[PDB]
Amino acid sequence: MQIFVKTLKGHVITLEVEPSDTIENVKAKIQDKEGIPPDQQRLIFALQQLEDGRTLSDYNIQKESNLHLVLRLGG
Amino acid sequence: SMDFLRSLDWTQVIAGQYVSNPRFNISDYFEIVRQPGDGNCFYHSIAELTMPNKTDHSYHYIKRLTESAARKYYQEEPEARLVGLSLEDYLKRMLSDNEWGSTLEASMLAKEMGITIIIWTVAASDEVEAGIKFGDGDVFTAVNLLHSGQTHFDALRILPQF
């Protein structure tokens, strides 16, 4: 399915993922599209910052869900 | 343009943390108080807005408030999951000379100090790309920081007319 990630800059991007994808995997997708190292990405959904080891199905992120990307600013 | 500031659209992404994407120039409402690019500029900026009679050493106090702030909050901070260090290893690195601050320290200091901190991020032209607010205050009551380029931080003072 397609899920939306609203980046920090403001614009929204699209990602093709399956519920079996890891948070680390999705971060790699964002890194490909936006060039953001996963070390700086804070993926947020349902007022929760998502954790690496888990997957999208562990969070029930369904078709056309809107996720937030907040960046870790400062080295 | 003060009806613009009392109308910012903050989105709470997690409890206590907000994001905004307004369209304004930082110079339209703030005064940039520049800070040395010495690697401690995050803490210089806070001291500039929180410690009267600031000096080039006042930032050590902010770092020490970050220490106690970390002992309270570090293990429960979502952004701390990205550091991947124990409280001891983090405290050593954080307290080391010329080690640079980040949004993780802004969140913990907001709690420790009982203030609201906003980090406005710009891209070269000082045109704001976004804002991250730690705390429930507004723009007039908060400690406004300016983040530019990679890791540099400067202090912002809301102008007398706003």
From Swiss-Prot, chain B:
The active site is at 41 (for ubiquitin thioesterase activity), 152 (for ubiquitin thioesterase activity), 154 (for ubiquitin thioesterase activity). Changing residue 130 to R: Complete loss of deISGylation and debubiquitination activities. Unable to block RIG-I-mediated gene activation. Residues 30-159 form the OTU domain. Changing residue 154 to A: 40-fold loss of proteolytic activity. It comes from the Viruses. Changing residue 41 to A: Loss of deubiquitinating and deISGylase activities. Changing residue 129 to T: Loss of 40% activity for debubiquitination and 75% for deISGylation activity. Residues 2-29 are annotated as: Essential for the vOTU enzymatic activity. Changing residue 152 to A: Loss of deubiquitinating and deISGylase activities. Classified as His(+) endonuclease since it has a histidine upstream of the active site that coordinates the first cation. Displays RNA-directed RNA polymerase, deubiquitinating and deISGylase activities. RNA-dependent RNA polymerase is responsible for replication and transcription of the viral RNA genome. During transcription, synthesizes subgenomic RNAs and assures their capping by a cap-snatching mechanism, which involves the endonuclease activity cleaving the host capped pre-mRNAs. These short capped RNAs are then used as primers for viral transcription. The viral OTU domain (vOTU) and its N-terminal extension is responsible for ubiquitin and ISG15 binding and for the deubiquitination and deISGylation activities. Interacts (via N-terminus) with host ISG15 (via C-terminus); the deISGylase activity of the viral protein interferes with antiviral signaling pathways mediated by NF-kappaB and IRF signalings. Interacts with host ubiquitin. Belongs to the Bunyavirales RNA polymerase family. This is RNA-directed RNA polymerase L. The gene is L.
